[PDB]
Amino acid sequence: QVQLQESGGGLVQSGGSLKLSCAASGSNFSSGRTFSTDAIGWFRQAPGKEREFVGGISWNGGITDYVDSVKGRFTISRDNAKNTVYLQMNSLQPEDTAVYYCAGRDSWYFSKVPDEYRYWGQGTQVTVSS
Amino acid sequence: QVQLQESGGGLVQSGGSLKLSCAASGSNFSSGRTFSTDAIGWFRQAPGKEREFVGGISWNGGITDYVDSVKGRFTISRDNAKNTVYLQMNSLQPEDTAVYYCAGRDSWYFSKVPDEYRYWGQGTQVTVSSA
Amino acid sequence: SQLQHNIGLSIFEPVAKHRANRIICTIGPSTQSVEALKGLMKSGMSVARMNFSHGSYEYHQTTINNVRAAAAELGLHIGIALDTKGPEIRTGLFKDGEATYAPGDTVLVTTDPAFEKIGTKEKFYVDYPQLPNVVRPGGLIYVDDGVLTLRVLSKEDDCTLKCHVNNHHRLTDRKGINLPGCEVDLPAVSEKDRKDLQFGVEQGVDMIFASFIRTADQVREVRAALGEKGKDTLIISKIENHQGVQNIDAIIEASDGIMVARGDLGVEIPAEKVVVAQMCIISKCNVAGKPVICATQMLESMTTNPRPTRAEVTDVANAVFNGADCVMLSGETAKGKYPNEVVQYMVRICIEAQSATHDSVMFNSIKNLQKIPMSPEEAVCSSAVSSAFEVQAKAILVLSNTGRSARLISKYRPNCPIICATTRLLTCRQLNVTRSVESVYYDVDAHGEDNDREKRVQLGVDWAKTKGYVSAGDVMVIVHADHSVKGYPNQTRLVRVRE
Amino acid sequence: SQLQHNIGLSIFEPVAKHRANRIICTIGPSTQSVEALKGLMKSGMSVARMNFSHGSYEYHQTTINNVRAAAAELGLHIGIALDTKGPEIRTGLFKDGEATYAPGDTVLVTTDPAFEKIGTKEKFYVDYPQLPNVVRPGGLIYVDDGVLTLRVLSKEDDCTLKCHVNNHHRLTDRKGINLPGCEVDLPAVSEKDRKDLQFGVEQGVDMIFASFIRTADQVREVRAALGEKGKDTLIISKIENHQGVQNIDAIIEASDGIMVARGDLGVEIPAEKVVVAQMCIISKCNVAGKPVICATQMLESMTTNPRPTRAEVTDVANAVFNGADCVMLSGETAKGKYPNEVVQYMVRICIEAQSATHDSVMFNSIKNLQKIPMSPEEAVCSSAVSSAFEVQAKAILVLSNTGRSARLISKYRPNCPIICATTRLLTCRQLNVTRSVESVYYDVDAHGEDNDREKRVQLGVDWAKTKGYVSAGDVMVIVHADHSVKGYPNQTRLVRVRE
Amino acid sequence: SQLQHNIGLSIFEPVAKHRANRIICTIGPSTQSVEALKGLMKSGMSVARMNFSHGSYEYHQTTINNVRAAAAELGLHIGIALDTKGPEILPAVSEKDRKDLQFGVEQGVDMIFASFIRTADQVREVRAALGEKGKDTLIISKIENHQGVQNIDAIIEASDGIMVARGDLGVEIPAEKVVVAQMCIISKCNVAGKPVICATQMLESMTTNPRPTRAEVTDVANAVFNGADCVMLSGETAKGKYPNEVVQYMVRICIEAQSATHDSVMFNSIKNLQKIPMSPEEAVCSSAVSSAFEVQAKAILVLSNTGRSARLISKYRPNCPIICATTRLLTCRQLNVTRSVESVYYDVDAHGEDNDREKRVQLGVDWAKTKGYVSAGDVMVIVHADHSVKGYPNQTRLVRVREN
């Protein structure tokens, strides 16, 4: 159906800034669903099978939510004309060492539960050195 | 409710012509009918006879109908902005002589039955003489 | 069955139903005159709404005084509602009335209390003071109703922010802004809200349309804000964001009624879902026996044209079919060229849709939701409605002082008018917002004590006779309390009108 | 109880039903391209409409071959519809495309074909040649959609009339004329119509949308106009005036389907009633088991905007709730900036409205209308749908060559998809307008005679397996004809899918 | 509703209904003759009961051969039942019972009437005694004391059928209680879809008088209304002076009660007691009966070999006869104890294997035609299994009978 494409992960300083990009390709059709009709969540996988939620944004960007570990530092956004969602993440620290995935729901609203999402990116590595 | 007032009746010679006018005022606030929402029928009653259906016009004038006795001779029209419904009578002949009523239905469409009407005008006399 | 009903419908038959849904009109420039108000009342207004989003106490005082004078003239009891401005970011005021922006411009957004009335394409004012501290560079600031998007670029002073406009949209004045960013710490009742609430209480409004209700605790904060003087005033929680739908069960429990603001709702959630949320909210309110109102986007095109669009008409009709108690007009009646005409259209749509609804489906669906052993109170109300159906009653007459009973009878959705005889004028006015009810007032002081509950019954029967509801020979259902208990009605009689 | 369903609805949960309603798209400049058609199909088009009100026989031959090629590319069976111009007085062509008229002006209205294309504010052409002999001085001529009115002042020439313009209005090209004098006596099919009907049979269209159908004899006439070459093709009567509604019962009996033209209905009858008339027509069609289409004013703003209004969306949703089989785009896909997106919106609205409906209500209501005894044919179809509910089947699979059976199962509104295994490609295409159905073609010429129906039955199960409908362990209902009879299915099987 | 049905009953209209209830007759001195057996059979009997409390092995061998002979002459499949002696005047299977049960198994009886059944364990001891040679014979458990009623649910799951010995019950429990116990047990069986029979005190006075008492007659009618599949005669047909007239009397009562019962109540009751994902077997059966009502079919032809389907269709109590086309003769005989069923036999060896399932169907339709049930133009419900399914009926056809 809809597919996602990610970019901008890498290595940076403790306290330095990155802007991860996640761009989306086609549609689903069976349900008339397309990137602009889907909420998007950003989830992170540290070393270990513990994908946890990082943030979420509704279909039209009018609603955002974050885990508290990241609140006030990270900014989730979306450009529907370009079919891309961004996770801005400055003033980064060693805890946020992880592989970062974007995922797209069925729905206009996002979830904190990974299994409630239908399409995923590959996950791109972010490492913050001390 | 709505009130109707006719005018324009009188005397004419066989083959002459008249224009009846019926002016409205008021509303059935209980429902929200203003003549601009109500169909209008025209009836006549000849002396000693009963109320004849003559013709009808839908709420916005896009639908009219006439009894065969008057088809091709009579014309019903209406102007909602002036709150007036009109009946034009051409080639008037003596048995069209009667008292003429306009009446208003609480529907967009008219009926040919007098009882299906909710409000009536006072009626105006039309007398068609021979010659 | 609705199917069976549908296939029997005729467009050529005149309808003969008594309008059961109720119409709320907001008051403004086109209608604040006493004469204008009388015309809206004749046209079918039941509650006059004051949008406290704009306007001075002197203005709203005037609206209040005029509607009381007009009602007094027509011998009516009209409810007055106070719609709060609410905890909503607003955009100052703009000079020469308007200002437009093109993408690629740069515009300052300041919180310096100055420039509040100046307001130029170049720099304008906003309601939130800590806006410079919360929205950081790159942040997305959505103005009007999300229509405009802005990106925060510059820091500037402690008071001002430089932002890139990502538009093509002309602003109109004192608009609201709903910024998606969090750390907003939204209040429930602003200081302005609180003083406006007192003004209402002190001046005697009948109901509060509480704005931007998100949680149940907000509804309690609003209750608190009305002091002992305001314990009798209804609170109707305005559901206008996703959280509103999220907590609708708690909010229904805590409120006296709900208002579905569909425009406000459409800004955060997709239309298709708003449709569904409306079905959900309205129906939950029906089952709870509390009034629900549909408010925005009603016959909006009629503010300037003398005809609405067909889709607009169906939208209204859909609200009624859906189960809505009241529909509410906004600009159409406040600042519109056709106030009486649009109220009369609302009257016509209500009657048409009520008449196309299957008389019995709601009574049956609500009754089958009921756990069995029913309370006596519930039994009495449901049974009065089924009695009315079986005898083909033309009216139910209930004698209720607070109106609780009248709402409980309306919940079972009978097919005839409900007449409520009260001794309280506050009840006459507050029942204007429940479907099918019509109040008759008994002046205890003016006449007897009606211990027997007999003068009141006469008052009710008399009314329904003059109203056009009942004639000699027809059957009426009368629900009241016996003279051995108090608190709630538990007694019912079936009477044939004589004259 | 929809009430019960409503109060359990959640907008936060993803939807799960499979789209049952069908989408008709009219083709024009934005879409006649083969690649555009492939995009329209992927997006959810099921039948492609040709508006014969305009276009050359070469133009429409192009649409036919392009939709054929696009479908072949995607492996789909798309129905092609021919929407007639119909016998309805129109005006002609203007110098420049436009001309404006002011109240108090005078305009000439001629039927001389020389002004046929040079139409100016001062004198313009009308197709009906005897219009001068029919409308007598003082008579009213309605143009566009009753927007422009004329009062005939004089019959100046042998074939032109001088008229006083009463309102102010700007007209553009080939708009329609309504003479409210009655006495117009329009045919059922114009000479142009008759030759277009022949063109349609000769190119193999699947269905005719017949215009301005007012009586049952008119649909019978249209039937006549298709020889035996075109007798297997569906006639869908467009109901667009008061007579259409008056005679709707006759018209359903004589037609294969109905099209509710809500725009044209609005010209003569008020909006509140169009709402009622639409419920009446849709439900009568449901009970007749015939397809019905809702047509006008669907998502019209999305011809130039990228989002429709919420009221437009609830209008569409309401059509589906109402019971409509299909919805039809017009300008949205013909001459519109956002064709694929509007089709997909309509898909999302269709699905949302399915899931908000109570699964069982329409079934129970249809069943309670049928008097006993039932025909064997109908008993088999109804009993098969109710089996489906009782075992919670994930799909019904009927083997129908003409499609009778699939329409009769659709009549009973099951819960799951209906898969029709047919040997006739024409029925594959025609079944695109009945709800829940999806065909699968069996080429007898390529394969066996499948007397034991095991190969077809497999093709169907397989189909439902691959499309995700059913998986090993689920239950399916299979309906067909026994090996002792032919003509109509009379036999049903209950199968657990194996893998 | 039954109320509405009652208020429009008339004692003057000839009643027209095909008898759905089945009569069991006990054989003794008055009826062991082959001629007398033929007379019982013509005058409505469907099963022959052997009372092993009295009589030698030779005596019952006589009755077995004689019923087989009279049945053969009339072309009917009559069942034979062996009524056990029981531990009478504690174990479940007396040694005598064991030898009697093996005699019955070796001689081919169709069912056992297990006496004094108290626990489900005892009915399973009986099934053990029957062995593999009697693996397929019906065990009908006779409830004749309070432990029987107390344990009725276990006893029903373990048995094939249940028999209410109301006279035996009346010795430990008061009569009004027996009334209530009969309704309980009949309906528990009705829901379970297993045959239930009423046994003692039936038309006992007709043993010596030419007509019974009105109270006796309503007692029989009240068994039928209560839901019982079968009624059983005891001394009436064994020692009695009017065996043929009493069987005929049972037939008239059965028909009148059947015609006085409301046709749909049972069906609606049984159906609404079912759980909402029905199983495909149960679904095909119920919907066949349902379809029969909706189309007013005059017959339901079911193709079962074991008769399972026929019992299941019967559980839903349709309006019309159920013709079972079977290939196993023991099923023809065992089905005589289920309400509304009538088996037609198709010899798979003597006639070509009906692999198509199509000749059996025709056989059934011809049977229904001749009996008088169905006439050219009438509809019928056909229920069988497809070329490839796992040994149970799963498809259903609706047929209009044509001139043939």
PDB file of C-alpha atoms in Angstrom, chain C residues 50-161:
ATOM      1  CA  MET C  50     -25.089  35.625  23.425  1.00  0.00           C
ATOM      2  CA  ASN C  51     -21.627  35.050  21.992  1.00  0.00           C
ATOM      3  CA  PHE C  52     -19.497  36.529  24.723  1.00  0.00           C
ATOM      4  CA  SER C  53     -16.536  36.145  22.339  1.00  0.00           C
ATOM      5  CA  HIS C  54     -17.289  39.761  21.366  1.00  0.00           C
ATOM      6  CA  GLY C  55     -19.222  42.491  23.029  1.00  0.00           C
ATOM      7  CA  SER C  56     -19.439  44.611  26.147  1.00  0.00           C
ATOM      8  CA  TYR C  57     -21.563  44.092  29.233  1.00  0.00           C
ATOM      9  CA  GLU C  58     -23.521  47.124  28.054  1.00  0.00           C
ATOM     10  CA  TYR C  59     -24.239  45.376  24.720  1.00  0.00           C
ATOM     11  CA  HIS C  60     -25.187  42.067  26.257  1.00  0.00           C
ATOM     12  CA  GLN C  61     -27.206  43.825  28.934  1.00  0.00           C
ATOM     13  CA  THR C  62     -29.135  45.395  26.058  1.00  0.00           C
ATOM     14  CA  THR C  63     -29.667  42.017  24.371  1.00  0.00           C
ATOM     15  CA  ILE C  64     -30.909  40.613  27.683  1.00  0.00           C
ATOM     16  CA  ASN C  65     -33.296  43.465  28.347  1.00  0.00           C
ATOM     17  CA  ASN C  66     -34.695  43.482  24.870  1.00  0.00           C
ATOM     18  CA  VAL C  67     -35.413  39.751  24.736  1.00  0.00           C
ATOM     19  CA  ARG C  68     -37.233  39.912  28.072  1.00  0.00           C
ATOM     20  CA  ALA C  69     -39.321  42.866  26.773  1.00  0.00           C
ATOM     21  CA  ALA C  70     -40.108  41.116  23.502  1.00  0.00           C
ATOM     22  CA  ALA C  71     -41.035  37.874  25.245  1.00  0.00           C
ATOM     23  CA  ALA C  72     -43.206  39.790  27.659  1.00  0.00           C
ATOM     24  CA  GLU C  73     -45.024  41.308  24.684  1.00  0.00           C
ATOM     25  CA  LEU C  74     -45.610  37.978  23.029  1.00  0.00           C
ATOM     26  CA  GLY C  75     -46.459  36.288  26.315  1.00  0.00           C
ATOM     27  CA  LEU C  76     -43.548  33.915  25.846  1.00  0.00           C
ATOM     28  CA  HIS C  77     -40.846  32.371  27.998  1.00  0.00           C
ATOM     29  CA  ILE C  78     -37.596  32.535  26.036  1.00  0.00           C
ATOM     30  CA  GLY C  79     -34.401  31.083  27.406  1.00  0.00           C
ATOM     31  CA  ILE C  80     -31.240  33.169  27.418  1.00  0.00           C
ATOM     32  CA  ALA C  81     -27.913  31.420  27.010  1.00  0.00           C
ATOM     33  CA  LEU C  82     -24.410  32.723  27.641  1.00  0.00           C
ATOM     34  CA  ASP C  83     -21.774  31.200  25.337  1.00  0.00           C
ATOM     35  CA  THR C  84     -18.319  31.669  26.903  1.00  0.00           C
ATOM     36  CA  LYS C  85     -15.353  33.074  24.970  1.00  0.00           C
ATOM     37  CA  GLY C  86     -13.285  30.359  26.486  1.00  0.00           C
ATOM     38  CA  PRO C  87      -9.599  29.577  26.714  1.00  0.00           C
ATOM     39  CA  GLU C  88      -8.878  30.301  23.089  1.00  0.00           C
ATOM     40  CA  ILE C  89      -5.964  32.241  21.660  1.00  0.00           C
ATOM     41  CA  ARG C  90      -7.238  35.342  19.858  1.00  0.00           C
ATOM     42  CA  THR C  91      -5.584  37.641  17.284  1.00  0.00           C
ATOM     43  CA  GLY C  92      -6.022  41.244  18.504  1.00  0.00           C
ATOM     44  CA  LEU C  93      -7.698  43.645  16.064  1.00  0.00           C
ATOM     45  CA  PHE C  94      -6.603  44.826  12.631  1.00  0.00           C
ATOM     46  CA  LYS C  95      -6.698  48.376  11.294  1.00  0.00           C
ATOM     47  CA  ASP C  96      -8.833  49.275   8.257  1.00  0.00           C
ATOM     48  CA  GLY C  97     -10.673  46.098   9.273  1.00  0.00           C
ATOM     49  CA  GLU C  98      -8.536  43.637   7.201  1.00  0.00           C
ATOM     50  CA  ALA C  99      -5.027  42.630   6.102  1.00  0.00           C
ATOM     51  CA  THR C 100      -3.767  40.004   3.627  1.00  0.00           C
ATOM     52  CA  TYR C 101      -0.507  37.997   3.374  1.00  0.00           C
ATOM     53  CA  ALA C 102       1.433  36.187   0.538  1.00  0.00           C
ATOM     54  CA  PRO C 103       3.797  33.200   1.075  1.00  0.00           C
ATOM     55  CA  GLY C 104       7.371  34.277   1.417  1.00  0.00           C
ATOM     56  CA  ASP C 105       6.478  37.362   3.407  1.00  0.00           C
ATOM     57  CA  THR C 106       7.832  37.922   6.897  1.00  0.00           C
ATOM     58  CA  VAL C 107       5.414  39.082   9.599  1.00  0.00           C
ATOM     59  CA  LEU C 108       5.980  39.855  13.274  1.00  0.00           C
ATOM     60  CA  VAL C 109       3.723  38.274  15.908  1.00  0.00           C
ATOM     61  CA  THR C 110       4.039  40.233  19.140  1.00  0.00           C
ATOM     62  CA  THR C 111       2.554  39.779  22.598  1.00  0.00           C
ATOM     63  CA  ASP C 112       3.322  43.384  23.684  1.00  0.00           C
ATOM     64  CA  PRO C 113      -0.192  44.506  24.815  1.00  0.00           C
ATOM     65  CA  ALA C 114       0.196  47.500  22.473  1.00  0.00           C
ATOM     66  CA  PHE C 115      -0.764  47.250  18.780  1.00  0.00           C
ATOM     67  CA  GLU C 116      -3.932  45.374  19.960  1.00  0.00           C
ATOM     68  CA  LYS C 117      -6.065  47.645  17.732  1.00  0.00           C
ATOM     69  CA  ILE C 118      -3.411  48.764  15.203  1.00  0.00           C
ATOM     70  CA  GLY C 119      -2.689  45.380  13.512  1.00  0.00           C
ATOM     71  CA  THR C 120      -0.850  45.605  10.176  1.00  0.00           C
ATOM     72  CA  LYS C 121       0.319  43.201   7.481  1.00  0.00           C
ATOM     73  CA  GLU C 122       3.780  43.646   9.159  1.00  0.00           C
ATOM     74  CA  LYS C 123       3.241  43.049  12.928  1.00  0.00           C
ATOM     75  CA  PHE C 124       0.159  41.948  14.942  1.00  0.00           C
ATOM     76  CA  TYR C 125      -0.905  40.982  18.475  1.00  0.00           C
ATOM     77  CA  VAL C 126      -1.954  37.641  20.027  1.00  0.00           C
ATOM     78  CA  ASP C 127      -3.800  36.656  23.205  1.00  0.00           C
ATOM     79  CA  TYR C 128      -1.190  34.281  24.724  1.00  0.00           C
ATOM     80  CA  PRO C 129       1.574  36.178  26.621  1.00  0.00           C
ATOM     81  CA  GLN C 130       4.183  33.383  26.905  1.00  0.00           C
ATOM     82  CA  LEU C 131       3.938  32.668  23.149  1.00  0.00           C
ATOM     83  CA  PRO C 132       7.563  33.860  22.630  1.00  0.00           C
ATOM     84  CA  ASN C 133       8.770  31.354  25.301  1.00  0.00           C
ATOM     85  CA  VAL C 134       6.831  28.242  24.081  1.00  0.00           C
ATOM     86  CA  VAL C 135       6.842  28.168  20.262  1.00  0.00           C
ATOM     87  CA  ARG C 136      10.501  27.714  19.238  1.00  0.00           C
ATOM     88  CA  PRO C 137      12.064  28.205  15.762  1.00  0.00           C
ATOM     89  CA  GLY C 138      10.443  26.154  13.030  1.00  0.00           C
ATOM     90  CA  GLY C 139       7.258  25.767  15.051  1.00  0.00           C
ATOM     91  CA  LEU C 140       4.007  25.723  13.115  1.00  0.00           C
ATOM     92  CA  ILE C 141       1.454  28.344  14.202  1.00  0.00           C
ATOM     93  CA  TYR C 142      -2.008  27.857  12.635  1.00  0.00           C
ATOM     94  CA  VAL C 143      -4.327  30.917  12.519  1.00  0.00           C
ATOM     95  CA  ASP C 144      -8.040  31.339  11.606  1.00  0.00           C
ATOM     96  CA  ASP C 145      -9.118  27.669  11.750  1.00  0.00           C
ATOM     97  CA  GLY C 146      -5.817  26.119  10.610  1.00  0.00           C
ATOM     98  CA  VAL C 147      -6.446  27.902   7.275  1.00  0.00           C
ATOM     99  CA  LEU C 148      -3.223  29.933   7.706  1.00  0.00           C
ATOM    100  CA  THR C 149       0.061  28.225   8.648  1.00  0.00           C
ATOM    101  CA  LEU C 150       3.102  30.201   9.893  1.00  0.00           C
ATOM    102  CA  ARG C 151       6.659  29.016  10.625  1.00  0.00           C
ATOM    103  CA  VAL C 152       8.536  30.571  13.560  1.00  0.00           C
ATOM    104  CA  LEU C 153      11.954  31.750  12.304  1.00  0.00           C
ATOM    105  CA  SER C 154      13.305  34.484  14.586  1.00  0.00           C
ATOM    106  CA  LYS C 155      13.585  35.150  18.330  1.00  0.00           C
ATOM    107  CA  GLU C 156      13.427  39.010  18.189  1.00  0.00           C
ATOM    108  CA  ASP C 157      12.598  40.637  21.581  1.00  0.00           C
ATOM    109  CA  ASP C 158      10.969  39.234  24.707  1.00  0.00           C
ATOM    110  CA  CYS C 159       7.670  40.410  23.127  1.00  0.00           C
ATOM    111  CA  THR C 160       7.889  39.609  19.391  1.00  0.00           C
ATOM    112  CA  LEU C 161       8.561  36.762  16.932  1.00  0.00           C
TER     113      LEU C 161
END
